[PDB]
Amino acid sequence: LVSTEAQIQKMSQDLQLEALTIQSETQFLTGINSQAANDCFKTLIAAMLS
């Protein structure tokens, strides 16, 4: 996979999330890691075959 500390650091600059205000762009990064990709790729293929 793309290295998670090298992808989420490029992602967090394009959002330009400010450290002070409650905005709807701090929730763009919740729950992205290596394990959630390997369990969504399986449950898409394995549900289609069944």
Partner 1 sequence: QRTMSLDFVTTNYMSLISGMWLLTVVPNDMFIRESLVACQLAIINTIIY
**Which residues in this chain contact partner 1 in the complex, by CB under 8 A?**
9-10, 13
The tokens describing 7, both together, are: 């992808």
Nearest approach in angstroms of CB 10 to partner 1 is 5
Contact 15, 25 (CB under 8 A): yes
DSSP letter for 9, please.
H
Nearest approach in angstroms of CB 5 to partner 1 is 11
Using alpha carbons only, give the angle 2, 9, 44 rounded to the nearest 5 degrees.
Answer: 40
Nearest approach in angstroms of CB 34 to partner 1 is 20
Q: Please identify, using beta-carbon distances, which residue of 9 and 34 lies nearer to partner 1.
A: 9
